[PDB]
């Protein structure tokens, strides 16, 4: 009975139920059993950590720990591999025996049928052992992958966060370790038994070949063995080319992500075309590298499929012209079978050695990484904290935060404000002075830089807490997100953060503040919650979010803002400057003790089944051009015909049992070499052409789309169309298609030859055909499904790792390390289950196909028994066993990847906007905004069809060169009205007349080129400062410098390294918010347009900076007309005409003095609120 369990485990019957069935119902993690307690990431991690700790006590090297953790399975797998290899070497011997016995006490052992039965049994045993080895090694490799992921995740949680240690590039290295390093180490562990087996297989094969064919065997073995060093050389060249391609791909991906993450600015500036051209240039560089890589892949395939032919040629010619006897058929076919046996190990030994080198470097990298550095609410005495480099960033720190009372700390930009919080949390290094709390309890913390979980908004706000409707609603209302969440595609469940629907900086800050408030933890550390928020939003938030909501819960609050106007509410105040606290006390106490501090603060105030998708497959094939497809298919057909002809020529030559045969064989070998060369070249060329043709139009169409598409569709899918799908099309498909074609042709040729040799074989072909059809049918669905699960469950794993390495401070301030560890384990287990069952399906198919092939070998042999043709048939029967499962697996992979091609193709057909317009090209003036006049008539605007009109028949006219400022409550249509001039939002009724031309009829690019707009949150694109100032590069440097002076950034630019070409980090992160805003103003200036639209430009600007910016703008653009959306009404007091928007209506339209004249005026009330 237990032998039945052993057979079930050897034949992977334990998964037949989930393969034969579960094609009707898709395979889901519910269907797949949870991982056995033995293989869970927890157990593997504890084992590997125990081994590593034993080593560390002995000291530690990761290799010895890995051995002590996963030796026994690897020894078992190597034993299985050796048994499989030895049994497999019984093929050629059996063929030789059968052939010799045919056509005319150990007598029984010589009987032909006995040899046939022995061959069949040996084949089934070899395949069973080989697949058992594969599965044991795969299982051990996946266990190791789980352990390593858990280990590096624990290290990530225990990181240091100092910029000396972590800096900014370290996150990239951490993501690399989680993604590529661990996978490469896992794959080395997958393939390691090859290092044990392949050299021994080569040795045994060459020994048998010598025993069969004297010195000719030595000659052939030398020629063949020359295939290992050549393969290693070509593999090195391929690795170099693929590293270059990877670098160019990462560059292109960063450029694309920048383009489609700030698409609104590009479209408004009409820069989309320039950035797309730059991305296309990077694509051309990537395609040059990819063409080199494809050329070397073609040469690798050529060598793989040719050097064996040259070796056979040398062996047999040397035997013919050296060996006295002729070529007995048995010897010839045994030699051919041995060469077929040795072709795979030699072509793969170079790959396993390269994998071993990559694993050694990966383990060195991991070893390097693991050593990376690591009434009174709170009391600090003689605090002295350092970031790690030994320099005392904070000195003489002594604070006392009252419990249950609001505390605010104030200082200059860069006065040890944000660092003090991290020091309190322990992230900093405590040189001297202990910190004593009421060991620490969880403390809610909203980092200065907002951090967002990729999960939905509801999850981010809740953040692992007991979802309570009342508290959730109260927080969301206090945070002013109730209408903003409704705006997003899903009211309460839309994706957020990287790889989700992008949000404005204000929205991110609001989400983070909501998360901090929602938690029940008593201590709360808020760091610049108002920086991104508008003035109205901040006022609303503090009026009740801080003063009411928190005080209702009697929670200690530590708010870090430079907005002094709210100091009146502070119960305790701490002044920090130059890393030292000026004083700590109440407002009145501080003022009495420090009159100078009060004066400084006042001055600062200044006041069901899915079939194979043939259609997409055919479209991909024809993408290269019908001629290229015809050349590929015809060349492959001719190549395989010539190879079969070589084998048949050998068969006839043996049956003859000489100079006339030598010449024929040599000529056919030459033809085979040439046709292999041609076939490889053509297939790779078709692959390259298809990749280029798809990607070019893909990117062009995506950029040409409409804004709402980016507004709703998550950025994850859009950027996945370029990151993974294009990678698949460029690299994975062409190889898979080539493998499929070659394997199908070889299988068909073998079937044909076997049938020709023994036409009776066709009788047994039918049951074998049916069995193969059923195996193909069931596997091609089970695989597809399991790969779907693997990818869909591997996305969240890397998302979790990335979002953990990001915002360590939040994780360790909430003290939610354990919960995140548990989630990491629960995700890595799921991913490993999916991958493990994918490999189990592969083993299932391989074993069933190997038994099918063993049946084929048995039937072909039995037919042959009842003179060289028998040997030829047996040889091809043996090769069918090798090639059948590869046909099936390549077909499955081709289907899966053509799915990605289909996705890209569907994205290739998308809506757009009528850039052409209708106005006469000659009609437009040379300088259209010459006068700058603006006139409107009953304008009506709606963001999307069937939605509520944002603007309600607003009618307005601006005289040339006038200056008008617009204000109003949030969601009153200010931003939409500003964007109206650019037709970023559809207009139902009314029109906008500028310079006597209705914009509606103008070409979109022409309209959006001659207008200058400054968004609320400034975004600056990576590249040179010149590039940001004018990508078209059509401005003399003098204009750039004049603009920089106008922006007041001339001094900073001069201080820049290159001055005029200083490097700019992605998104303008290099500079400050004020510097970025000034640079955006300069960007607007260079356009030399007469109309400027400032949509809440100075939201993050300070009072003095805002005033100086406004005055310099007015002086510089005195002639030009400007429309400004006022962040604060006080900024637009000196305006020619004032407009206030309320619920999409311009209630007030008159001069600022006239508007202020009205009693209880809305604007007048706003001014009082600001004051
Ligand atoms: C994730 C599973 O991956 C496997 C992993 C294994 C373990 C293994 O010794 N591979 C040998 C192949 C054998 C036939 C020589 C090998 C060696 C060098 C380079 C690639 C490869 N192989 C890479 C995978 C498939 C192509 C040849 C077996 C089989 C598989 C499999 O696909 O089922
Ligand atoms: N994590 C860090 N890595 C490297 N240098 C740091 C780090 N944190 C602080 N510093 C340096 O130590 C000093 C203290 O920073 P401080 O607390 O003043 O930042 P902050 O000005 O409060 O934050 P922000 O300017 O974003 O409001 C600064 O001069 C800063 O450059
Ligand atoms: N992308 C969008 N899709 C649909 N409606 C939008 C979109 N953006 C804004 N709105 C709607 O337009 C109104 C005004 O928004 P907006 O002009 O952006 O802010 P403001 O009120 O500051 O002008 C809001 O009530 C909002 O619901
Ligand atoms: Mg800060
Ligand atoms: Mg707005």
JSON list of N, CA, C and O in Angstrom, two decimals, residues 8-15 19 127-139 142 187 190 775 779 783 786 835-851 885-886 889:
[
{"chain": "A", "resi": 8, "resn": "UNK", "atom": "N", "xyz": [2.63, 7.57, -6.23]},
{"chain": "A", "resi": 8, "resn": "UNK", "atom": "CA", "xyz": [1.92, 8.84, -6.37]},
{"chain": "A", "resi": 8, "resn": "UNK", "atom": "C", "xyz": [2.88, 10.01, -6.24]},
{"chain": "A", "resi": 8, "resn": "UNK", "atom": "O", "xyz": [2.75, 11.00, -6.97]},
{"chain": "A", "resi": 9, "resn": "UNK", "atom": "N", "xyz": [3.83, 9.93, -5.31]},
{"chain": "A", "resi": 9, "resn": "UNK", "atom": "CA", "xyz": [4.79, 11.01, -5.15]},
{"chain": "A", "resi": 9, "resn": "UNK", "atom": "C", "xyz": [5.80, 11.06, -6.29]},
{"chain": "A", "resi": 9, "resn": "UNK", "atom": "O", "xyz": [6.35, 12.12, -6.58]},
{"chain": "A", "resi": 10, "resn": "UNK", "atom": "N", "xyz": [6.07, 9.92, -6.93]},
{"chain": "A", "resi": 10, "resn": "UNK", "atom": "CA", "xyz": [7.01, 9.90, -8.04]},
{"chain": "A", "resi": 10, "resn": "UNK", "atom": "C", "xyz": [6.38, 10.36, -9.34]},
{"chain": "A", "resi": 10, "resn": "UNK", "atom": "O", "xyz": [7.07, 10.91, -10.21]},
{"chain": "A", "resi": 11, "resn": "UNK", "atom": "N", "xyz": [5.07, 10.15, -9.50]},
{"chain": "A", "resi": 11, "resn": "UNK", "atom": "CA", "xyz": [4.35, 10.54, -10.70]},
{"chain": "A", "resi": 11, "resn": "UNK", "atom": "C", "xyz": [3.60, 11.85, -10.53]},
{"chain": "A", "resi": 11, "resn": "UNK", "atom": "O", "xyz": [2.86, 12.26, -11.43]},
{"chain": "A", "resi": 12, "resn": "UNK", "atom": "N", "xyz": [3.76, 12.52, -9.40]},
{"chain": "A", "resi": 12, "resn": "UNK", "atom": "CA", "xyz": [3.07, 13.78, -9.13]},
{"chain": "A", "resi": 12, "resn": "UNK", "atom": "C", "xyz": [1.57, 13.63, -9.32]},
{"chain": "A", "resi": 12, "resn": "UNK", "atom": "O", "xyz": [0.89, 14.55, -9.76]},
{"chain": "A", "resi": 13, "resn": "UNK", "atom": "N", "xyz": [1.05, 12.45, -8.97]},
{"chain": "A", "resi": 13, "resn": "UNK", "atom": "CA", "xyz": [-0.39, 12.26, -8.97]},
{"chain": "A", "resi": 13, "resn": "UNK", "atom": "C", "xyz": [-1.06, 13.12, -7.92]},
{"chain": "A", "resi": 13, "resn": "UNK", "atom": "O", "xyz": [-2.27, 13.36, -8.00]},
{"chain": "A", "resi": 14, "resn": "UNK", "atom": "N", "xyz": [-0.31, 13.62, -6.94]},
{"chain": "A", "resi": 14, "resn": "UNK", "atom": "CA", "xyz": [-0.90, 14.40, -5.87]},
{"chain": "A", "resi": 14, "resn": "UNK", "atom": "C", "xyz": [-1.46, 15.71, -6.40]},
{"chain": "A", "resi": 14, "resn": "UNK", "atom": "O", "xyz": [-2.19, 16.41, -5.68]},
{"chain": "A", "resi": 15, "resn": "UNK", "atom": "N", "xyz": [-1.13, 16.05, -7.64]},
{"chain": "A", "resi": 15, "resn": "UNK", "atom": "CA", "xyz": [-1.66, 17.26, -8.25]},
{"chain": "A", "resi": 15, "resn": "UNK", "atom": "C", "xyz": [-2.51, 16.98, -9.48]},
{"chain": "A", "resi": 15, "resn": "UNK", "atom": "O", "xyz": [-2.98, 17.93, -10.12]},
{"chain": "A", "resi": 19, "resn": "UNK", "atom": "N", "xyz": [-5.02, 19.43, -11.62]},
{"chain": "A", "resi": 19, "resn": "UNK", "atom": "CA", "xyz": [-4.70, 19.70, -13.02]},
{"chain": "A", "resi": 19, "resn": "UNK", "atom": "C", "xyz": [-5.83, 19.23, -13.92]},
{"chain": "A", "resi": 19, "resn": "UNK", "atom": "O", "xyz": [-6.34, 20.01, -14.74]},
{"chain": "A", "resi": 127, "resn": "UNK", "atom": "N", "xyz": [13.44, 8.64, -16.47]},
{"chain": "A", "resi": 127, "resn": "UNK", "atom": "CA", "xyz": [12.63, 9.84, -16.44]},
{"chain": "A", "resi": 127, "resn": "UNK", "atom": "C", "xyz": [12.06, 10.08, -15.05]},
{"chain": "A", "resi": 127, "resn": "UNK", "atom": "O", "xyz": [12.04, 11.21, -14.57]},
{"chain": "A", "resi": 128, "resn": "UNK", "atom": "N", "xyz": [11.61, 9.02, -14.37]},
{"chain": "A", "resi": 128, "resn": "UNK", "atom": "CA", "xyz": [11.09, 9.19, -13.02]},
{"chain": "A", "resi": 128, "resn": "UNK", "atom": "C", "xyz": [12.16, 9.73, -12.09]},
{"chain": "A", "resi": 128, "resn": "UNK", "atom": "O", "xyz": [11.91, 10.67, -11.33]},
{"chain": "A", "resi": 129, "resn": "UNK", "atom": "N", "xyz": [13.36, 9.16, -12.13]},
{"chain": "A", "resi": 129, "resn": "UNK", "atom": "CA", "xyz": [14.42, 9.63, -11.25]},
{"chain": "A", "resi": 129, "resn": "UNK", "atom": "C", "xyz": [14.83, 11.06, -11.59]},
{"chain": "A", "resi": 129, "resn": "UNK", "atom": "O", "xyz": [15.05, 11.88, -10.70]},
{"chain": "A", "resi": 130, "resn": "UNK", "atom": "N", "xyz": [14.95, 11.37, -12.88]},
{"chain": "A", "resi": 130, "resn": "UNK", "atom": "CA", "xyz": [15.36, 12.71, -13.27]},
{"chain": "A", "resi": 130, "resn": "UNK", "atom": "C", "xyz": [14.35, 13.74, -12.81]},
{"chain": "A", "resi": 130, "resn": "UNK", "atom": "O", "xyz": [14.73, 14.79, -12.27]},
{"chain": "A", "resi": 131, "resn": "UNK", "atom": "N", "xyz": [13.06, 13.46, -12.99]},
{"chain": "A", "resi": 131, "resn": "UNK", "atom": "CA", "xyz": [12.06, 14.41, -12.55]},
{"chain": "A", "resi": 131, "resn": "UNK", "atom": "C", "xyz": [11.99, 14.49, -11.03]},
{"chain": "A", "resi": 131, "resn": "UNK", "atom": "O", "xyz": [11.74, 15.56, -10.48]},
{"chain": "A", "resi": 132, "resn": "UNK", "atom": "N", "xyz": [12.22, 13.38, -10.33]},
{"chain": "A", "resi": 132, "resn": "UNK", "atom": "CA", "xyz": [12.29, 13.45, -8.88]},
{"chain": "A", "resi": 132, "resn": "UNK", "atom": "C", "xyz": [13.43, 14.36, -8.43]},
{"chain": "A", "resi": 132, "resn": "UNK", "atom": "O", "xyz": [13.27, 15.16, -7.50]},
{"chain": "A", "resi": 133, "resn": "UNK", "atom": "N", "xyz": [14.58, 14.25, -9.09]},
{"chain": "A", "resi": 133, "resn": "UNK", "atom": "CA", "xyz": [15.69, 15.14, -8.77]},
{"chain": "A", "resi": 133, "resn": "UNK", "atom": "C", "xyz": [15.32, 16.59, -9.04]},
{"chain": "A", "resi": 133, "resn": "UNK", "atom": "O", "xyz": [15.58, 17.48, -8.22]},
{"chain": "A", "resi": 134, "resn": "UNK", "atom": "N", "xyz": [14.72, 16.85, -10.20]},
{"chain": "A", "resi": 134, "resn": "UNK", "atom": "CA", "xyz": [14.32, 18.21, -10.52]},
{"chain": "A", "resi": 134, "resn": "UNK", "atom": "C", "xyz": [13.40, 18.76, -9.45]},
{"chain": "A", "resi": 134, "resn": "UNK", "atom": "O", "xyz": [13.58, 19.90, -8.99]},
{"chain": "A", "resi": 135, "resn": "UNK", "atom": "N", "xyz": [12.42, 17.97, -9.02]},
{"chain": "A", "resi": 135, "resn": "UNK", "atom": "CA", "xyz": [11.44, 18.49, -8.07]},
{"chain": "A", "resi": 135, "resn": "UNK", "atom": "C", "xyz": [12.05, 18.68, -6.69]},
{"chain": "A", "resi": 135, "resn": "UNK", "atom": "O", "xyz": [11.74, 19.66, -6.01]},
{"chain": "A", "resi": 136, "resn": "UNK", "atom": "N", "xyz": [12.91, 17.76, -6.25]},
{"chain": "A", "resi": 136, "resn": "UNK", "atom": "CA", "xyz": [13.53, 17.94, -4.94]},
{"chain": "A", "resi": 136, "resn": "UNK", "atom": "C", "xyz": [14.39, 19.19, -4.93]},
{"chain": "A", "resi": 136, "resn": "UNK", "atom": "O", "xyz": [14.35, 19.99, -3.99]},
{"chain": "A", "resi": 137, "resn": "UNK", "atom": "N", "xyz": [15.19, 19.38, -5.98]},
{"chain": "A", "resi": 137, "resn": "UNK", "atom": "CA", "xyz": [16.02, 20.57, -6.04]},
{"chain": "A", "resi": 137, "resn": "UNK", "atom": "C", "xyz": [15.18, 21.83, -6.10]},
{"chain": "A", "resi": 137, "resn": "UNK", "atom": "O", "xyz": [15.51, 22.83, -5.46]},
{"chain": "A", "resi": 138, "resn": "UNK", "atom": "N", "xyz": [14.09, 21.81, -6.87]},
{"chain": "A", "resi": 138, "resn": "UNK", "atom": "CA", "xyz": [13.23, 22.99, -6.97]},
{"chain": "A", "resi": 138, "resn": "UNK", "atom": "C", "xyz": [12.62, 23.32, -5.62]},
{"chain": "A", "resi": 138, "resn": "UNK", "atom": "O", "xyz": [12.56, 24.48, -5.20]},
{"chain": "A", "resi": 139, "resn": "UNK", "atom": "N", "xyz": [12.13, 22.30, -4.91]},
{"chain": "A", "resi": 139, "resn": "UNK", "atom": "CA", "xyz": [11.54, 22.51, -3.60]},
{"chain": "A", "resi": 139, "resn": "UNK", "atom": "C", "xyz": [12.55, 23.11, -2.64]},
{"chain": "A", "resi": 139, "resn": "UNK", "atom": "O", "xyz": [12.24, 24.07, -1.92]},
{"chain": "A", "resi": 142, "resn": "UNK", "atom": "N", "xyz": [13.18, 26.81, -3.55]},
{"chain": "A", "resi": 142, "resn": "UNK", "atom": "CA", "xyz": [12.11, 27.71, -3.15]},
{"chain": "A", "resi": 142, "resn": "UNK", "atom": "C", "xyz": [12.12, 27.91, -1.64]},
{"chain": "A", "resi": 142, "resn": "UNK", "atom": "O", "xyz": [11.86, 29.01, -1.14]},
{"chain": "A", "resi": 187, "resn": "UNK", "atom": "N", "xyz": [18.00, 30.35, -8.38]},
{"chain": "A", "resi": 187, "resn": "UNK", "atom": "CA", "xyz": [18.20, 29.61, -9.62]},
{"chain": "A", "resi": 187, "resn": "UNK", "atom": "C", "xyz": [19.51, 28.85, -9.61]},
{"chain": "A", "resi": 187, "resn": "UNK", "atom": "O", "xyz": [19.60, 27.74, -10.13]},
{"chain": "A", "resi": 190, "resn": "UNK", "atom": "N", "xyz": [18.67, 25.89, -7.87]},
{"chain": "A", "resi": 190, "resn": "UNK", "atom": "CA", "xyz": [17.92, 25.02, -8.76]},
{"chain": "A", "resi": 190, "resn": "UNK", "atom": "C", "xyz": [18.85, 24.18, -9.61]},
{"chain": "A", "resi": 190, "resn": "UNK", "atom": "O", "xyz": [18.65, 22.98, -9.80]},
{"chain": "A", "resi": 775, "resn": "UNK", "atom": "N", "xyz": [-3.10, 15.49, -22.65]},
{"chain": "A", "resi": 775, "resn": "UNK", "atom": "CA", "xyz": [-2.09, 16.11, -21.80]},
{"chain": "A", "resi": 775, "resn": "UNK", "atom": "C", "xyz": [-1.90, 17.57, -22.19]},
{"chain": "A", "resi": 775, "resn": "UNK", "atom": "O", "xyz": [-1.88, 18.47, -21.34]},
{"chain": "A", "resi": 779, "resn": "UNK", "atom": "N", "xyz": [-2.82, 20.63, -19.61]},
{"chain": "A", "resi": 779, "resn": "UNK", "atom": "CA", "xyz": [-1.70, 21.42, -19.11]},
{"chain": "A", "resi": 779, "resn": "UNK", "atom": "C", "xyz": [-1.74, 22.84, -19.64]},
{"chain": "A", "resi": 779, "resn": "UNK", "atom": "O", "xyz": [-1.42, 23.78, -18.91]},
{"chain": "A", "resi": 783, "resn": "UNK", "atom": "N", "xyz": [-1.33, 25.36, -16.56]},
{"chain": "A", "resi": 783, "resn": "UNK", "atom": "CA", "xyz": [-0.16, 26.23, -16.51]},
{"chain": "A", "resi": 783, "resn": "UNK", "atom": "C", "xyz": [-0.58, 27.68, -16.59]},
{"chain": "A", "resi": 783, "resn": "UNK", "atom": "O", "xyz": [-0.40, 28.44, -15.64]},
{"chain": "A", "resi": 786, "resn": "UNK", "atom": "N", "xyz": [-1.77, 28.86, -13.44]},
{"chain": "A", "resi": 786, "resn": "UNK", "atom": "CA", "xyz": [-0.80, 28.93, -12.35]},
{"chain": "A", "resi": 786, "resn": "UNK", "atom": "C", "xyz": [0.17, 30.08, -12.55]},
{"chain": "A", "resi": 786, "resn": "UNK", "atom": "O", "xyz": [0.58, 30.73, -11.58]},
{"chain": "A", "resi": 835, "resn": "UNK", "atom": "N", "xyz": [4.40, 29.46, -7.04]},
{"chain": "A", "resi": 835, "resn": "UNK", "atom": "CA", "xyz": [5.56, 29.05, -7.83]},
{"chain": "A", "resi": 835, "resn": "UNK", "atom": "C", "xyz": [5.80, 27.55, -7.71]},
{"chain": "A", "resi": 835, "resn": "UNK", "atom": "O", "xyz": [6.12, 26.88, -8.70]},
{"chain": "A", "resi": 836, "resn": "UNK", "atom": "N", "xyz": [5.66, 27.01, -6.51]},
{"chain": "A", "resi": 836, "resn": "UNK", "atom": "CA", "xyz": [5.92, 25.60, -6.29]},
{"chain": "A", "resi": 836, "resn": "UNK", "atom": "C", "xyz": [4.91, 24.75, -7.04]},
{"chain": "A", "resi": 836, "resn": "UNK", "atom": "O", "xyz": [5.27, 23.71, -7.60]},
{"chain": "A", "resi": 837, "resn": "UNK", "atom": "N", "xyz": [3.65, 25.16, -7.08]},
{"chain": "A", "resi": 837, "resn": "UNK", "atom": "CA", "xyz": [2.68, 24.39, -7.83]},
{"chain": "A", "resi": 837, "resn": "UNK", "atom": "C", "xyz": [2.84, 24.58, -9.33]},
{"chain": "A", "resi": 837, "resn": "UNK", "atom": "O", "xyz": [2.52, 23.68, -10.10]},
{"chain": "A", "resi": 838, "resn": "UNK", "atom": "N", "xyz": [3.36, 25.73, -9.76]},
{"chain": "A", "resi": 838, "resn": "UNK", "atom": "CA", "xyz": [3.74, 25.84, -11.17]},
{"chain": "A", "resi": 838, "resn": "UNK", "atom": "C", "xyz": [4.81, 24.81, -11.51]},
{"chain": "A", "resi": 838, "resn": "UNK", "atom": "O", "xyz": [4.72, 24.11, -12.53]},
{"chain": "A", "resi": 839, "resn": "UNK", "atom": "N", "xyz": [5.83, 24.70, -10.67]},
{"chain": "A", "resi": 839, "resn": "UNK", "atom": "CA", "xyz": [6.87, 23.71, -10.92]},
{"chain": "A", "resi": 839, "resn": "UNK", "atom": "C", "xyz": [6.32, 22.29, -10.81]},
{"chain": "A", "resi": 839, "resn": "UNK", "atom": "O", "xyz": [6.76, 21.40, -11.55]},
{"chain": "A", "resi": 840, "resn": "UNK", "atom": "N", "xyz": [5.37, 22.06, -9.91]},
{"chain": "A", "resi": 840, "resn": "UNK", "atom": "CA", "xyz": [4.76, 20.75, -9.83]},
{"chain": "A", "resi": 840, "resn": "UNK", "atom": "C", "xyz": [3.99, 20.42, -11.10]},
{"chain": "A", "resi": 840, "resn": "UNK", "atom": "O", "xyz": [4.01, 19.27, -11.55]},
{"chain": "A", "resi": 841, "resn": "UNK", "atom": "N", "xyz": [3.31, 21.40, -11.68]},
{"chain": "A", "resi": 841, "resn": "UNK", "atom": "CA", "xyz": [2.65, 21.17, -12.96]},
{"chain": "A", "resi": 841, "resn": "UNK", "atom": "C", "xyz": [3.66, 20.85, -14.05]},
{"chain": "A", "resi": 841, "resn": "UNK", "atom": "O", "xyz": [3.43, 19.97, -14.89]},
{"chain": "A", "resi": 842, "resn": "UNK", "atom": "N", "xyz": [4.78, 21.56, -14.05]},
{"chain": "A", "resi": 842, "resn": "UNK", "atom": "CA", "xyz": [5.81, 21.26, -15.04]},
{"chain": "A", "resi": 842, "resn": "UNK", "atom": "C", "xyz": [6.31, 19.83, -14.89]},
{"chain": "A", "resi": 842, "resn": "UNK", "atom": "O", "xyz": [6.47, 19.12, -15.88]},
{"chain": "A", "resi": 843, "resn": "UNK", "atom": "N", "xyz": [6.54, 19.39, -13.65]},
{"chain": "A", "resi": 843, "resn": "UNK", "atom": "CA", "xyz": [6.98, 18.02, -13.42]},
{"chain": "A", "resi": 843, "resn": "UNK", "atom": "C", "xyz": [5.90, 17.02, -13.81]},
{"chain": "A", "resi": 843, "resn": "UNK", "atom": "O", "xyz": [6.20, 15.95, -14.35]},
{"chain": "A", "resi": 844, "resn": "UNK", "atom": "N", "xyz": [4.64, 17.34, -13.54]},
{"chain": "A", "resi": 844, "resn": "UNK", "atom": "CA", "xyz": [3.55, 16.48, -13.95]},
{"chain": "A", "resi": 844, "resn": "UNK", "atom": "C", "xyz": [3.57, 16.27, -15.45]},
{"chain": "A", "resi": 844, "resn": "UNK", "atom": "O", "xyz": [3.57, 15.13, -15.94]},
{"chain": "A", "resi": 845, "resn": "UNK", "atom": "N", "xyz": [3.62, 17.37, -16.21]},
{"chain": "A", "resi": 845, "resn": "UNK", "atom": "CA", "xyz": [3.65, 17.25, -17.66]},
{"chain": "A", "resi": 845, "resn": "UNK", "atom": "C", "xyz": [4.89, 16.50, -18.12]},
{"chain": "A", "resi": 845, "resn": "UNK", "atom": "O", "xyz": [4.80, 15.65, -19.01]},
{"chain": "A", "resi": 846, "resn": "UNK", "atom": "N", "xyz": [6.04, 16.80, -17.53]},
{"chain": "A", "resi": 846, "resn": "UNK", "atom": "CA", "xyz": [7.27, 16.15, -17.97]},
{"chain": "A", "resi": 846, "resn": "UNK", "atom": "C", "xyz": [7.21, 14.65, -17.73]},
{"chain": "A", "resi": 846, "resn": "UNK", "atom": "O", "xyz": [7.62, 13.87, -18.59]},
{"chain": "A", "resi": 847, "resn": "UNK", "atom": "N", "xyz": [6.69, 14.22, -16.58]},
{"chain": "A", "resi": 847, "resn": "UNK", "atom": "CA", "xyz": [6.62, 12.80, -16.30]},
{"chain": "A", "resi": 847, "resn": "UNK", "atom": "C", "xyz": [5.62, 12.11, -17.21]},
{"chain": "A", "resi": 847, "resn": "UNK", "atom": "O", "xyz": [5.89, 11.02, -17.74]},
{"chain": "A", "resi": 848, "resn": "UNK", "atom": "N", "xyz": [4.44, 12.71, -17.41]},
{"chain": "A", "resi": 848, "resn": "UNK", "atom": "CA", "xyz": [3.46, 12.07, -18.28]},
{"chain": "A", "resi": 848, "resn": "UNK", "atom": "C", "xyz": [3.97, 11.98, -19.71]},
{"chain": "A", "resi": 848, "resn": "UNK", "atom": "O", "xyz": [3.80, 10.96, -20.37]},
{"chain": "A", "resi": 849, "resn": "UNK", "atom": "N", "xyz": [4.61, 13.04, -20.19]},
{"chain": "A", "resi": 849, "resn": "UNK", "atom": "CA", "xyz": [5.18, 13.00, -21.53]},
{"chain": "A", "resi": 849, "resn": "UNK", "atom": "C", "xyz": [6.35, 12.04, -21.63]},
{"chain": "A", "resi": 849, "resn": "UNK", "atom": "O", "xyz": [6.56, 11.44, -22.68]},
{"chain": "A", "resi": 850, "resn": "UNK", "atom": "N", "xyz": [7.12, 11.88, -20.55]},
{"chain": "A", "resi": 850, "resn": "UNK", "atom": "CA", "xyz": [8.21, 10.92, -20.58]},
{"chain": "A", "resi": 850, "resn": "UNK", "atom": "C", "xyz": [7.68, 9.49, -20.64]},
{"chain": "A", "resi": 850, "resn": "UNK", "atom": "O", "xyz": [8.25, 8.65, -21.34]},
{"chain": "A", "resi": 851, "resn": "UNK", "atom": "N", "xyz": [6.60, 9.21, -19.93]},
{"chain": "A", "resi": 851, "resn": "UNK", "atom": "CA", "xyz": [5.98, 7.89, -20.05]},
{"chain": "A", "resi": 851, "resn": "UNK", "atom": "C", "xyz": [5.38, 7.70, -21.44]},
{"chain": "A", "resi": 851, "resn": "UNK", "atom": "O", "xyz": [5.45, 6.60, -22.01]},
{"chain": "A", "resi": 885, "resn": "UNK", "atom": "N", "xyz": [7.87, 17.14, -24.45]},
{"chain": "A", "resi": 885, "resn": "UNK", "atom": "CA", "xyz": [7.49, 18.00, -23.34]},
{"chain": "A", "resi": 885, "resn": "UNK", "atom": "C", "xyz": [7.95, 19.42, -23.58]},
{"chain": "A", "resi": 885, "resn": "UNK", "atom": "O", "xyz": [7.31, 20.37, -23.11]},
{"chain": "A", "resi": 886, "resn": "UNK", "atom": "N", "xyz": [9.04, 19.60, -24.32]},
{"chain": "A", "resi": 886, "resn": "UNK", "atom": "CA", "xyz": [9.46, 20.95, -24.66]},
{"chain": "A", "resi": 886, "resn": "UNK", "atom": "C", "xyz": [8.51, 21.60, -25.65]},
{"chain": "A", "resi": 886, "resn": "UNK", "atom": "O", "xyz": [8.23, 22.79, -25.55]},
{"chain": "A", "resi": 889, "resn": "UNK", "atom": "N", "xyz": [5.59, 22.69, -23.34]},
{"chain": "A", "resi": 889, "resn": "UNK", "atom": "CA", "xyz": [5.90, 23.81, -22.46]},
{"chain": "A", "resi": 889, "resn": "UNK", "atom": "C", "xyz": [6.12, 25.09, -23.24]},
{"chain": "A", "resi": 889, "resn": "UNK", "atom": "O", "xyz": [5.67, 26.17, -22.83]}
]
